[PDB]
Each structure stands twice: as C-alpha cells, then as structure tokens.
Amino acid sequence: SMNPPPPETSNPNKPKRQTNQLQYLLRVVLKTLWKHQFAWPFQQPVDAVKLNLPDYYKIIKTPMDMGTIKKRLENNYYWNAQECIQDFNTMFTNCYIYNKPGDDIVLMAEALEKLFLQKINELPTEE
Numbered sequence: 001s002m003n004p005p006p007p008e009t010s011n012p013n014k015p016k017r018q019t020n021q022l023q024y025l026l027r028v029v030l031k032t033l034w035k036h037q038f039a040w041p042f043q044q045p046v047d048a049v050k051l052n053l054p055d056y057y058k059i060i061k062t063p064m065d066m067g068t069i070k071k072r073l074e075n076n077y078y079w080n081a082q083e084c085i086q087d088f089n090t091m092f093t094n095c096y097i098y099n100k101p102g103d104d105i106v107l108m109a110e111a112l113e114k115l116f117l118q119k120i121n122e123l124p125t126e127e
C-alpha cells in the first residue's frame with residue numbers, strides 16, 4: 001500500500017498573523033525538539049513503504065510529524081498557537097496508537113513529549 005500525500009503546509013488564501021506564541025513555537029519549541037537525539041523518527045512523515053509498515057496508514061488516519069509542523073509555522077499556516085500544539089500532540093499520540101506500551105519508540109516519544117511540555121510551560125503571554 002501507498003503513502004498518503006503529506007499534510008497541507010501552505011495555503012496562500014488563509015489570513016496570516018505573527019504572534020509571540022507562534023514565534024516561540026518555531027524558534028524555541030520546534031528548534032529544541034528538532035535537535036534532540038530522539039527526534040529522527042519524527043522529523044518527516046512516516047514512510048510506510050520504505051519501512052515496510054503496510055498497516056501504518058490503515059491505523060493512523062491523522063498523520064503528523066515535525067517536518068510538517070516546521071513548514072506550517074514558517075508558512076504562517078497556523079492562526080492560533082493551539083493549532084500547532086494540537087499537531088504536536090497528534091504526533092505523540094500517533095506513536096502511542098501505532099505502537100505498544102513500553103516499546104522503545106514509545107519511550108522516545110514520551111521523552112520528547114515531556115520536553116515539549118517543559119518548553120510549552122514557558123509559552124509567552126500573547127502580547
């Protein structure tokens with residue numbers, strides 16, 4: 001079975017705004033998670049063809065990854081910070097859904113989620 005197209009990352013017809021929270025999500029949150037030693041499985045869409053995971057997109061119907069999130073932030077695809085936070089949570093929960101408690105990849109995602117939560121804790125007041 002085939003991979004789906006990646007999630008939409010750019011829509012020129014959407015209204016655009018810069019906020020302190022969106023800037024922080026790109027320059028601090030995404031940046032920190034991206035450079036983490038456990039980031040690599042999450043830096044691009046899961047390639048189920050290359051990885052021989054034929055059931056991945058039978059199970060995961062809302063794919064999300066940090067490559068997509070980076071693109072959405074840098075193309076001003078998000079209007080509300082919560083949209084971006086939701087995408088990070090989708091990425092983590094997808095990993096938990098496809099895999100099982102205690103799997104190495106799950107432990108990796110858990111660590112990244114903990115780091116994410118520490119970084120989101122210091123999200124600036126929308127100002």
Ligand SMILES: COC(=O)C1(NCC(=O)Nc2nnc(C)s2)CC(C)(C)OC(C)(C)C1
Pocket residue numbers: 041042046051053094095098099105
């Ligand atoms: C865990 O990830 C991986 O690196 C591996 N593939 C499965 C996979 O990618 N699962 C994902 N679940 N959520 C993601 C986001 S990635 C794991 C094993 C099976 C040990 O060996 C290969 C080489 C195929 C790489």
